Structures are given as C-alpha cells and as structure tokens.
Amino acid sequence: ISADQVNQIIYNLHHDPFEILGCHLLEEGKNTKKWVVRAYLPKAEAAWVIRPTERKEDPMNSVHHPNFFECIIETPELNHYQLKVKEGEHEKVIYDPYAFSSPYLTDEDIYLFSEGNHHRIYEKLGAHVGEINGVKGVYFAVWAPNARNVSVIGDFNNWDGREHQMRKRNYTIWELFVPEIGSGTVYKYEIKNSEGHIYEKSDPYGFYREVRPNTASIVVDIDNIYQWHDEEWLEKRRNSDPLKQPVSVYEVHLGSWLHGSSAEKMPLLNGEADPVIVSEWNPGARFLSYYELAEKLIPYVKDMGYTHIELLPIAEHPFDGSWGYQVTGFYSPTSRFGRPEDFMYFVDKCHENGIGVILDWVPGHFPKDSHGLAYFDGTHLYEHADPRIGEHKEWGTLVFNYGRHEVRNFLVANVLFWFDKYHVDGIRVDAVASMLYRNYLRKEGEWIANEYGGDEHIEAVSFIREVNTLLFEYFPGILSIAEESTEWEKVSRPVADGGLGFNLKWDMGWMHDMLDYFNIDPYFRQYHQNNVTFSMLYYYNENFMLALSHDEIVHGKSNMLGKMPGDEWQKYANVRALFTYMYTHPGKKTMFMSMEFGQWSEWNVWGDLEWHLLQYEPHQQLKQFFTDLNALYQQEPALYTHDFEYHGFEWIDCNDNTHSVVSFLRRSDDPNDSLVVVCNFTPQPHSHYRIGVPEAGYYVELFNSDAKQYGGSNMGNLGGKWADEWSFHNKPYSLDLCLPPLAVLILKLDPTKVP
Ligand SMILES: [Mg+2]
Ligand SMILES: [Mg+2]
Ligand SMILES: [Mg+2]
Numbered sequence: 001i002s003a004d005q006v007n008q009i010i011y012n013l014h015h016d017p018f019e020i021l022g023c024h025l026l027e028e029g030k031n032t033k034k035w036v037v038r039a040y041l042p043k044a045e046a047a048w049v050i051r052p053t054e055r056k057e058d059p060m061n062s063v064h065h066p067n068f069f070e071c072i073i074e075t076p077e078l079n080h081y082q083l084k085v086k087e088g089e090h091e092k093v094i095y096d097p098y099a100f101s102s103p104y105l106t107d108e109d110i111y112l113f114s115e116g117n118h119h120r121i122y123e124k125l126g127a128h129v130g131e132i133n134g135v136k137g138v139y140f141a142v143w144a145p146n147a148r149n150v151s152v153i154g155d156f157n158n159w160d161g162r163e164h165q166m167r168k169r170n171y172t173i174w175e176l177f178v179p180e181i182g183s184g185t186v187y188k189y190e191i192k193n194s195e196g197h198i199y200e201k202s203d204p205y206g207f208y209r210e211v212r213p214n215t216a217s218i219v220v221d222i223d224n225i226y227q228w229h230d231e232e233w234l235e236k237r238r239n240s241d242p243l244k245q246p247v248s249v250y251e252v253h254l255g256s257w258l259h260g261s262s263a264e265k266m267p268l269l270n271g272e273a274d275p276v277i278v279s280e281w282n283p284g285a286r287f288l289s290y291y292e293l294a295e296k297l298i299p300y301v302k303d304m305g306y307t308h309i310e311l312l313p314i315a316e317h318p319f320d321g322s323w324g325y326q327v328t329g330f331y332s333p334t335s336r337f338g339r340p341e342d343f344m345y346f347v348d349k350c351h352e353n354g355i356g357v358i359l360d361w362v363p364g365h366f367p368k369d370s371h372g373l374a375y376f377d378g379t380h381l382y383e384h385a386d387p388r389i390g391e392h393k394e395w396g397t398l399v400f401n402y403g404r405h406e407v408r409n410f411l412v413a414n415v416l417f418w419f420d421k422y423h424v425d426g427i428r429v430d431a432v433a434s435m436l437y438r439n440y441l442r443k444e445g446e447w448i449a450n451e452y453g454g455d456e457h458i459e460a461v462s463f464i465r466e467v468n469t470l471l472f473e474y475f476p477g478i479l480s481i482a483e484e485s486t487e488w489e490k491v492s493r494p495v496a497d498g499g500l501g502f503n504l505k506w507d508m509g510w511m512h513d514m515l516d517y518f519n520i521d522p523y524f525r526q527y528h529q530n531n532v533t534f535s536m537l538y539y540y541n542e543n544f545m546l547a548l549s550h551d552e553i554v555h556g557k558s559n560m561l562g563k564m565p566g567d568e569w570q571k572y573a574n575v576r577a578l579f580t581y582m583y584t585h586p587g588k589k590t591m592f593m594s595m596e597f598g599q600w601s602e603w604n605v606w607g608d609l610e611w612h613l614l615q616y617e618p619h620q621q622l623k624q625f626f627t628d629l630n631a632l633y634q635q636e637p638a639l640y641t642h643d644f645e646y647h648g649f650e651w652i653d654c655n656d657n658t659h660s661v662v663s664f665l666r667r668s669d670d671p672n673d674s675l676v677v678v679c680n681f682t683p684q685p686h687s688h689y690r691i692g693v694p695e696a697g698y699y700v701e702l703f704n705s706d707a708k709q710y711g712g713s714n715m716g717n718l719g720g721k722w723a724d725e726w727s728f729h730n731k732p733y734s735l736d737l738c739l740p741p742l743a744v745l746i747l748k749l750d751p752t753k754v755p
C-alpha cells in the first residue's frame with residue numbers, strides 16, 4: 001500500500017476504508033493464493049494474524065505509520081482468522097472489523113455454508129441491521145431449500161407478507177432487504193411448502209424473541225448494544241491452562257434461584273420492561289432480569305468464593321418445566337430475563353469480579369413445537385428423516401441430522417456464537433450418550449447399525465470432535481465439559497489422540513458412589529469402604545469434574561440434608577464431611593444452588609430457593625463452611641495444580657473399613673505445599689489415631705469440618721500436632737491425631753514453627 005492511501009485512512013479522508021482494510025486477494029498461484037490483511041489499530045504497537053484452524057500465527061508489520069499494519073499470507077483460502085492486537089502491556093484477540101463489506105450473502109458465504117464450514121454464518125443468516133442501495137434497513141435471510149415460497153411477516157406490514165416475498169438464492173436460501181425498519185422489529189417467516197400449506201416460523205438464527213408463550217423473533221443490532229470491559233479477563237483466560245487452576249462451580253437455574261414481585265416492572269440495564277410472571281399458579285412472583293441477577297447473584301457468588309457460575313440452558317426455550325433442555329431459539333438468550341444486552345452485562349460483571357461463566361448447551365435434540373426447527377421447509381430439514389436416528393421417542397423430541405452440512409453448520413457456528421458475542425468461558429453438554437449411540441433408548445429391531453455394523457453414531461462423533469477442535473482453536477483457555485454415562489472412552493482427551501475433545505468429564509460413578517455411601521447408616525459403611533476408594537482406580541483415564549448437580553436433588557431423591565442418616569446434627573455433619581472430601585479429592589468441583597445453605601426441600605423449578613432458611617444459625621453456619629472451603633481451595637495449590645497427575649495424590653491408608661477412616665496426601669510443585677487429609681465417616685470420635693506423614697515437623701490443623709463455627713462439636717487438635725519419629729503406614733514419621741466425629745481434617749507442615 002502507498003503512504004498516500006495510509007494517510008487517507010489515518011486522517012479519515014478515505015472514501016471507503018473497506019477498499020483497503022480487511023482481507024484482500026493479491027494474486028493466484030498454481031496451488032495457492034497470496035492475500036494481504038490490513039488493519040488500522042490506533043494505539044497498538046504490534047499485531048498478528050492468527051489462523052486458528054491451521055494453528056498458524058503471522059506478525060503484522062507497520063507500514064508507513066506505526067498504527068497501520070499489513071500482513072501478507074499465502075494460503076488457498078483465508079476465510080477464518082483473528083487479529084491479535086497489542087496496546088502497551090495488553091493483548092486482545094478479535095475478529096477483523098473489516099471482514100464483511102456488505103450485509104448480504106456473498107457467493108463465498110453460500111459456498112462455505114453449503115459445505116458446512118461457515119464459522120460466522122450468523123453474521124449473514126437471521127436478521128441484521130445494515131445498508132443496501134444507500135438505504136438503511138434490515139437484511140433477512142433463511143435456509144429453506146424446499147420451500148415453495150417464504151415471506152417476511154411482522155409488525156411493520158401488519159402480518160401480511162404479500163409485499164415482502166423473499167428471493168431465493170442458489171436454490172437454497174431466501175433473502176430480503178426491508179428499508180427503514182431497525183432493531184426492535186417483531187417478525188416471523190411465513191413459509192409455503194411443496195404441498196401449498198402455509199405456516200409461520202420463528203427465525204432459526206434470531207437474536208431475541210418475544211416472551212414465552214409468544215414466539216415472534218425480534219431484530220437486534222447485536223454489535224451496537226453493549227460496551228464490554230473484560231479485556232484483561234479474556235487475556236488471562238487465553239494465556240492460562242484452566243486444568244491447572246482452581247475450578248469451583250456454582251450451578252444455577254436462572255428462572256428458580258430468586259424471584260421478585262410481579263407488582264412492579266422488571267428493571268433492565270438503563271430501562272425496564274413488563275414483569276414476566278413465573279406461572280399462572282404463582283402470579284405474585286416474577287423472574288429477575290439478567291441485570292438484577294448481575295446485581296444480586298454475582299456478589300453472592302463472589303462472597304461464597306466460587307470461581308465459576310454454570311447456567312442451566314439459557315437459549316430460548318418455550319416451557320419452564322423443561323429446565324431449558326428443550327430449546328427452540330438457539331441463537332438467543334431467553335427473554336424471560338430481559339434483553340441480549342442485559343445478559344452481556346451479566347457476563348461482563350462476572351468477569352469484572354473474576355468469575356467465569358459456563359453455559360449448558362443443548363445440541364442433542366430439539367422439541368417438535370411448530371414455531372421451532374421441526375419439518376422446517378416441509379421436509380425433515382434439521383432432523384434426520386428416519387425416526388430410528390431422527391427421533392428420541394421416549395422424550396418426544398427430534399434429533400439433528402449431524403451429517404447434513406448446513407445442520408452441522410448451524411450447531412458448530414452456534415457454539416462459537418456464544419463465545420464470540422457473549423464472551424462465555426465454557427460450555428457443558430448433558431447426556432452426550434444420546435448423541436453418541438445409534439441404539440440410544442431404542443428397542444431391538446427399531447434402530448440400524450452404522451456402515452461398519454456397530455452402534456456408534458458416526459456423524460455425531462464427527463460433529464462433537466469438530467466442535468471441540470474449533471472451540472479450543474478459536475478460544476484457547478475455555479472449558480468444554482461433558483456428562484457421558486456409558487463409559488465411552490477418551491471423552492476428555494484430544495481429538496488427535498482418538499478423543500472427543502472435551503477437557504473435563506463429570507465423574508458420574510463418583511457421584512453415585514458418594515451419595516450412595518453417605519445415605520448408608522454409619523455403622524454399615526464398613527461394608528462399603530469400596531465406595532470411598534473405587535473411583536481413584538479409573539480416575540486418570542479422564543480429566544474428572546466432581547459434580548453434585550441439580551439432577552440429584554429432584555424427583556424424590558431429597559436435597560443433601562435429607563439424604564443423610566441420623567439426627568439433625570449428624571445430617572449436617574455428614575454434608576460437611578462429604579463436601580470436605582469432595583473438595584480434597586482430586587478433580588474440579590461443581591455443586592448446585594441450595595446445597596450451600598442446607599435447603600431441606602428438593603429443588604422446585606417453579607418456585608425460588610428457600611432463602612428464609614438463612615435467618616437461622618444452622619443454615620448460616622453451613623454457608624460459612626462453604627465460604628471458607630472455597631477460600632481454602634483457592635489458597636492451597638496442592639488442591640488444584642496436580643489434579644490430573646499421579647504426583648498430586650497418594651493414599652496414606654484406606655484399609656481401616658471397620659472405622660470408615662481414610663487418609664491421603666495432596667501435592668503440588670513445592671513440597672512444602674503438601675497436605676495431609678484425614679476423613680472420619682462415622683460419628684465415633686477418636687482420641688488417638690495414628691497417621692503416617694512423610695516429614696518431621698509441626699502439622700498445622702489448617703481445616704477442620706467439625707469446627708464450632710460450621711456447626712460442629714469443636715473437637716480436634718488445638719492448632720496442630722508435632723509428628724513423632726514413629727514409623728507408620730510405610731512412612732518414617734506419624735501424627736497421633738484426635739479425629740472429630742463425621743469430619744474431615746486437612747493438615748499442613750509449617751517448616752518454620754519454633755520447637
Ligand atoms: Mg396473510
Ligand atoms: Mg441424564
Ligand atoms: Mg456396593
């Protein structure tokens with residue numbers, strides 16, 4: 001580029017910066033092409049072009065001005081890239097602001113979507129504010145290749161589409177530009193199918209939607225509604241390995257954590273809306289907005305000390321009672337809680353408070369509701385036509401055709417969308433087995449094998465691997481979490497190693513072992529010591545997340561206290577011993593709302609949590625217990641640096657079944673950070689109980705779940721214990737401990753104590 005052209009850009013004299021900024025083809029070779037990417041990045045000292053899908057990164061050079069950058073790259077196609085921009089000591093990674101010069105679908109857009117590889121398809125499908133022929137308006141576009149006709153109906157035309165009939169391009173996608181309408185426009189698509197039947201559909205790629213049970217889509221100027229402040233969070237994320245950090249997740253269903261009064265408006269970020277009543281049977285109650293949740297949930301979580309909030313599915317869904325797991329509006333956060341910019345604010349405020357956001361994401365199926373994806377264009381478009389692979393009959397839902405390019409594209413681009421537009425830090429997928437198996441919940445003779453005679457759903461495995469490959473290339477540093485309940489191998493291993501590419505898997509066998517164990521009267525736990533220890537046998541085959549989820553405190557399973565045997569004191573004590581054990585056992589941590597304060601009743605998705613319980617001491621003490629346990633977890637490296645390495649854990653003794661005692665070490669990089677953990681899973685106290693330790697010195701009683709401030713009896717070692725030179729459990733030194741009833745101790749060597 002010339003200095004004249006550079007200065008035109010710098011001084012805002014250029015007639016159209018898209019002529020020179022962005023990606024431009026320079027020349028075509030035999031087997032490749034030469035491209036330049038240009039950027040004007042005021043205040044940046046350095047930049048790079050990342051091609052994350054090729055695992056390449058190229059520096060940009062300043063050309064004529066220190067803040068004008070060019071990068072020449074040779075490659076056959078340059079469809080997928082990011083700019084890394086350094087401004088002083090800080091780096092950000094963004095999409096190129098000059099990537100798309102028009103709002104309409106190009107030929108290239110259509111080709112990439114036809115192949116399934118358009119990672120930013122949602123910039124062109126759906127509804128977008130833009131300019132065509134010199135006039136501002138909205139561009140609509142929708143994939144409906146077998147439709148006979150499609151029209152845009154909406155507020156702007158009184159729901160009559162005759163003068164807003166769309167144009168079909170390339171026998172596949174319908175489009176329309178509508179001048180002078182903008183964000184807030186309410187619309188649907190009116191489709192006629194090959195039989196001549198006329199019906200109405202929400203926008204598959206819609207960004208916002210009326211409040212259930214109304215289904216119209218709503219136009220959102222998604223890049224001009226919210227100003228983020230989370231660059232430093234995002235930078236630290238990208239540059240960090242979350243597997244080596246503390247990850248303590250507070251699992252939340254947004255609709256049932258806390259309700260407000262329906263006698264007042266729902267406040268929004270600078271605005272308000274009418275209240276959303278929770279149900280016709282509880283009409284005095286309304287949902288809190290994303291804005292109110294940012295003001296209330298976030299400081300709650302921060303004070304409790306969790307590192308992450310995991311949300312049950314927030315994608316648009318028509319029925320409260322599905323919990324979010326039957327989604328019909330994949331590209332929009334539910335309007336129960338307000339607007340897209342209110343959820344953006346929630347995520348930005350989490351990041352400001354150093355809390356990450358993990359979304360449950362639901363790619364496995366979709367319900368049959370007529371407004372949604374089903375039989376979309378008058379054929380089986382999103383779902384597979386064969387019900388043996390296309391329907392989950394026991395659930396009444398439909399299964400995406402994962403092998404179909406444009407369907408795979410809808411879902412792969414949708415995962416990316418949430419990280420792009422909403423800055424989230426991770427996803428979790430429930431019931432991954434529902435995708436992986438062609439015989440899932442199907443009787444003999446009602447499914448068919450794959451092309452090699454097996455039960456593996458090949459197309460779904462390929463889709464899952466593609467999602468995880470892409471997500472980690474575009475957004476290193478995220479969490480991708482699976483629940484898979486059939487012992488499918490290598491769930492949380494890289495794709496290149498034959499994995500599914502997740503980085504964490506819920507340890508469902510651990511959850512079953514623990515909750516079954518603690519439900520046993522303590523005298524009988526001696527017959528089930530194996531429940532305590534078994535999950536370490538297979539532990540190193542995956543990277544495990546220890547999750548006690550919403551699914552475990554519904555349907556007659558009781559909340560945590562109600563699972564435990566004994567009198568009220570003992571029920572509490574069992575809860576503290578389980579969770580102390582959970583937080584010291586190798587693996588990351590997840591627990592669900594209400595567990596932290598000892599709610600007695602099961603989770604009820606139709607009301608809010610029983611917050612009045614926190615007026616009472618035993619609930620306050622249990623909440624303090626979790627506040628202190630989360631603090632300890634973040635403070636002690638040996639509870640999180642080596643979760644997934646043999647070094648991080650070793651049993652000391654786990655043979656004393658008769659007294660349901662077990663003990664173990666956790667380690668980190670510094671040997672002085674090693675912790676001794678001792679568990680007593682009966683109410684029998686022990687005045688003298690010997691445990692082997694690896695070094696001489698004073699072992700501070702760093703944590704004791706029987707402390708009085710947690711509701712315990714206050715038994716323990718009065719600060720700590722000097723080790724004896726008395727060999728025990730195959731170690732040279734040993735502690736003669738007092739073991740409190742139904743309690744866990746954590747001890748730590750203080751190599752500076754005065755003898
Ligand atoms: Mg009509
Ligand atoms: Mg399940
Ligand atoms: Mg058993």
Ligand SMILES: [Mg+2]
Pocket residue numbers: 607608609610
């Ligand atoms: Mg209530």
